[PDB]
Symmetry: C3
Subunit: 353 residues, 3 copies
C-alpha cells in the first residue's frame, strides 16, 4: 500500500526503502486516509453511462475498509434493483453502513435487470464510498459515491441534497431503457446528455405547464435532439487523469474536549448527519491533483490487500503504517553515524572537545 | 483520550506534551482499561431515581468499547420494557454481549412505556458496562452496570446475586408507577427510600406472615411514611465527586501457561462466569479516588472518539496508546542530550576520558 | 503467546526476557502466523477414531482467530449432524467463514446424535482450521481441518478434492454406528482400518461389479476381518510428537502491484478458491518438525488469550507482537553501552581519536 509523503513541496509515493530520517511522525494524527471521488478526474456522471461501469459477479467475497476524510460529491447513486421474477438483486445494507453523507444530487434508480451475479462490483477497480466506509459492492437502497482511497502522512505544521428518481429496465446489460420520473405517472425518456440541472429545470416546466399524465394512464414524453442541454468549471506523483478538480471540499469528523458546550452526550448530541467538520483545501503545492492520482495509484495495492485478508471490515491499515514506520528505523540495532540510524550526536561532540 | 500515569506518588492525566523520558512502558501489559461503577461516587441506586438518568433518542448510532478490569457492583439492572401496543422497546443483545459478571442485587424491571426513541442512552454521558464491553445503549434483558472507563499505565513494579423483580407503568416519563414484585400476584408500592436490603426483608415477612394474595386477585400493598428504612459505609487528578469508595474490589481475567492443571481446553474449562480473577485494591497513594475521577474525566473525550469512528466495537484504543507512546519519542530524529531524545550517554563518557 | 525465532540455525521460543539485540524486525512482513495440521504429527484420520476427539459443551462462548499460512491436508471433515427429533446440532457458518481451501479427501458425515451441548469443541485443545480462520467450534456443513497455529519471526534473508460421504447414528457417544455411502441406497459397514484410498477402490468395485441395491430396498454390506487394507510415507523447541512430516506443503495469499495483468479488479479476478500461493518447504535447519511442535506448544497460551478477550474474531495478535518488540528495547531510556540498549557507537569512536 503506497504511502503519500510531502518532500520538496511535492507529493510523493514511497514506504519500503525511502527511509528519510528527516521525516517526523510524532503522532497518529498525522496519519490520514482520504476518500476522493472519481468526479474529480472528470468521469461522466449521468445515470446511463455510469451504470455501465458496474457489473455483477459471484464467487468473490465482498470487502470493506474505513476512511477518515471524504469529498463533497455533486452526484451520488442509490439503487433499488430487482429481478423480473420479483427477487431483489442487491443485499441489504449491513449493520452500521449508512449512505454517503454529502451529495448535491442523489440519483435514486428503480427497475429490473437479469442480475447474473450475487454482488455488483466496479468494472474498473474503484470503491463504493459510504459513510466513512468504502466497499467493493453495492448495497440495496444505500446512497453511495464512486471513489478511491489514498493514504497520507501530514506534515507537523498544520495536519488537516435533491433526490432524482429514475426507472430502469434490463438493468446491467447492453440494452437498457431509462425513464426520468417526474411523478408516479409522468416520465421522460432519458439521454446521456441530460445533466442534473437539466432534469430539475425540465421537472419544473412539466409540473407548471400542466403536462402531467392522467390518474392511471402512463405517459412517456421524449426530448428531440434539437433541444440543447465538468461540473466544477460550469517517485513523484504525476496526475495522468483526464481532468483534475484543483480544490478539495472535504468532510471529516472532529474530536476535542470542549465539545461545543456539553454535546458529547449522545442523548443530546447531533444526529448521524451533523457530526461532520468541513473545510476547503486549495491546490497549494499541487497536493489536490497529486492526491487524486495517489488514490488512483493506491487502488491496485489496496484491492489485493483486501482480497488476502479474511476480515470483513479492515480498520488497522493506519496503525500498521505507524508500526512499520518504527520498525524500519528502530527495528534493528541503531549504528550511530550509519545511514540507517536516525540518531544525531552533533550536539554532544562540543562537550568532548 | 486522557491517559493516567503515576508521578510523585500521584495519579495524573497527560499524553500529548508530557514526554517524561523517565516513564517506562516496556510491555503492553502495563496498559490497562478499567470500568469503574458510578456507585463509587455516591449516586442513588434505587430503581425510581435511576431510571430518570435514562432516555430514548433516535438518529444516533450505538457505540461499544471493551475494557479489561471492572468493579464489583452492589446494584445492577436488567430491563424488559415494552410499548403499550405490545412492541418491544429495547433491542436484543448482539452476539457476544452478556450481562455484567458481578452484581450483588439485580434489579429486573418489567413494564410499559412510550419509548419515544430507538435506543435508550445515558442522560449524563456515562456508559452501560457489560461483560468487558461498555455500550452507550441499553439492551433488552441484559444485566448492566452504570459506569465509566479510565485508561492507565501501570508502574513496572506490580502491574495489576439476588434477583429483585419490579413492575413499571409509563416507563421513561415524569409520571411513572413502580411495583415491587413479591410474587406474580403480590406487589408493594415502591418508594425512592426503599433499599435493597429493605425489599428482601419485606419479602420474607410477607411470605412468612401469610399476606400473599388470592389465586388471580391482584393485591397491591403500601408502606406508610412512618415505616423506617452510601452502601460501602453501611495536571493532577482532583476527585470532585460527591463521595468516593476508597477501596476497589475489581474483577479481571488472568492468563498464564500453567492454567491450573489442563483447564485451557475450552471443553473442560470453566463456564462464562468462572473465568475471572479477583482482587482488593486499597487507596494507597490515593489511586482509587483519583481513578474514579479519571474515568469520569475520560468519558467526554471517549464519547466523541466513539462518535467519529464507524466501528461498532472498538478494541484498538490501548494499542493506539502504545504506538503514540513510541512515536512521541522515537518518531523523529533523536538529538542526543536534547530535551526530546531519551537516550543517555553518561556511561560512555568515562571510557573517552 | 510464545514467539518463534531462529537462533543458531535452530527454532526457539522466547519473548519476554530474550532481548536479543541482534534480532532484526524491520517490517511486519517478517511476522507470520501458520496453521499446521494435526496430520503432520501422525494422529489417526479415519472417521470413527477422529469423532471421538470432539464433544459438545455449553456455557463456553466460541472464539475465532485468523492465520495467514496453512497446510495442505490429506483429510478434512464436513459435518451435517442433527438430533433425533429433527433439530440441527451445529450452528450455521458465520459471515465470511468458508471451508478449508486445500483438502485431498473430504469426509462429509451425515447422521444423528444426542448433541448434549450447544457447540462442539476439541477434547484436546486443538483448533478447527478454516479459510485463514481457526475456530474452537465446529460449524454445520463447513469443511474444516484439525490443526493448531504457531507464531514466527522470519529472518530478513528470505521471508516466506474427493468427497467421501458417510452415515452416522448416535453421533458423539461411546456407541456409534457409521456407514460408508456408496450411493443413496448402497452402504458399507465402516471400520477404523479403512483408509481413504480403500474406500474409493471399494467404491469402484461395487459400482462396476453391479453390486448396487434395489430402488428403495436398503442394502448394507460388510467387510470381513480377513480383507487387508502415516500418509506421507505411504529454550529450544523439542518435537515430542509421535511422528513428524518433515516437509511443509503450505498455502498462502500473495500481494504485489504487478497483479498478473489487471487481475486485482474483483469483478475480473479469481474466485474464492484461486487466490492462493503455494510452496514446498523442506526440513532445512529442522524448522518443519520444530514448527509443528511450536504450534502445539503455542495452543495452551493461545486458548486462554481467546478466553479472556470479549472479541469474537481476533486479528491483532501479530500487531501486538511488533508493538511489544519495540517497547521492550525502546520503551524506556536507552542507556548506551548498557545491556538493554541496542545502540552501537563503535563507528563514532574512531572520529574522536
Ligand atoms: C485510474 O486511472 C486510470 C487511467 O488509465 C483508469 O483506467 C481506465 O480503465 C478502464 C478499464 O479498467 C479503461 O476502459 C479506461 O479507458 C481507463 N481510462 C479512463 C480514463 O477511464 C482507472 O479506471 C482509474 N481508476 C482506478 C484504477 O480505480
Ligand atoms: C462526572 O461528574 C460530574 C460532576 O459534575 C457529573 O455531572 C452531573 O451532570 C448532570 C447532567 O449532566 C447534572 O444534572 C448533575 O448535577 C451533575 N453532578 C452530579 C453530582 O450528578 C457527571 O454526571 C459525572 N459522570 C460523567 C461525566 O460521566
Ligand atoms: C500436543 O501434543 C500432546 C502430546 O502429549 C498431545 O497430548 C495428548 O493429550 C490427550 C488429552 O489431552 C491425551 O489423551 C493424549 O494421550 C496426548 N498425547 C497424544 C500423542 O495424543 C496434544 O493433544 C497435542 N495437541 C495440542 C496440545 O493441541
Ligand atoms: C419536481 O417538482 C415537484 C414540484 O415542483 C417536486 O415536488 C418534485 O420533488 C420535483 N422533482 C425533483 C426530482 O426535483
Ligand atoms: C422472596 O421470598 C421467597 C420465599 O422466601 C423467594 O422464593 C423469593 O425469591 C424472594 N424474592 C426475592 C426478590 O428475594
Ligand atoms: C463412487 O463411484 C461413482 C461412479 O464410479 C462416483 O459417481 C462416486 O462419486 C464415487 N464415490 C466416491 C466417494 O468417490
Amino acid at each position: 500500500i503506497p504511502l503519500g509523503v510531502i518532500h520538496n513541496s511535492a507529493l510523493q509515493v514511497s514506504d519500503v526503502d525511502k527511509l528519510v530520517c528527516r521525516d517526523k511522525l510524532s503522532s497518529t494524527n498525522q496519519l490520514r486516509s482520504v476518500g476522493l471521488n472519481l468526479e474529480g478526474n472528470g468521469v461522466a456522471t449521468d445515470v446511463p453511462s455510469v451504470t455501465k461501469r458496474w457489473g455483477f459477479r459471484s464467487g468473490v467475497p465482498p470487502k470493506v475498509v474505513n476512511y477518515e476524510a471524504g469529498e463533497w460529491a455533486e452526484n451520488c447513486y442509490n439503487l433499488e434493483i430487482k429481478k423480473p421474477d420479483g427477487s431483489e438483486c442487491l443485499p441489504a445494507a449491513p449493520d452500521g453502513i449508512r449512505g454517503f453523507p454529502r451529495c448535491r444530487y442523489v440519483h435514486k434508480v428503480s427497475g429490473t435487470g437479469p442480475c447474473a451475479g450475487d454482488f455488483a462490483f466496479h468494472k474498473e477497480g474503484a470503491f463504493f464510498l459510504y459513510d466513512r466506509l468504502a466497499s467493493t459492492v453495492i448495497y440495496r437502497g444505500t446512497t453511495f459515491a464512486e471513489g478511491v482511497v489514498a493514504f497520507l502522512i501530514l506534515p507537523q505544521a498544520k495536519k488537516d441534497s435533491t433526490t432524482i428518481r429514475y426507472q430502469a429496465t434490463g438493468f446491467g446489460t447492453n440494452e437498457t431503457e431509462y425513464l426520468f420520473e417526474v411523478d408516479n405517472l409522468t416520465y421522460v425518456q432519458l439521454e446521456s446528455r441530460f445533466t442534473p440541472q437539466f432534469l430539475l429545470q425540465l421537472n419544473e416546466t412539466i409540473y407548471a405547464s400542466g403536462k402531467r399524465s392522467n390518474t392511471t394512464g402512463k405517459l412517456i414524453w421524449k426530448v428531440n435532439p434539437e433541444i440543447d442541454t465538468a461540473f466544477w468549471e460550469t517517485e513523484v506523483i504525476v496526475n495522468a487523469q483526464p481532468k483534475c478538480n484543483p480544490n478539495l471540499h472535504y468532510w471529516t469528523t472532529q474530536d476535542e474536549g470542549a465539545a461545543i458546550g456539553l454535546a458529547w452526550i449522545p442523548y443530546f448530541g447531533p444526529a448521524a448527519e451533523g457530526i461532520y467538520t468541513e473545510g476547503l483545501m486549495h491546490n497549494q503545492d499541487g497536493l489536490i491533483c497529486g492526491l487524486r492520482q495517489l488514490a488512483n495509484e493506491t487502488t491496485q495495492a489496496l484491492q489485493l490487500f483486501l482480497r488476502a485478508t479474511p476480515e470483513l471490515r479492515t480498520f488497522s491499515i493506519l496503525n500498521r503504517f505507524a508500526i512499520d514506520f518504527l520498525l524500519q528505523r528502530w527495528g534493528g540495532t541503531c549504528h550511530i553515524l550509519g545511514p540507517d540510524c536516525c540518531i544525531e550526536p552533533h550536539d554532544w561532540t562540543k562537550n568532548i572537545t
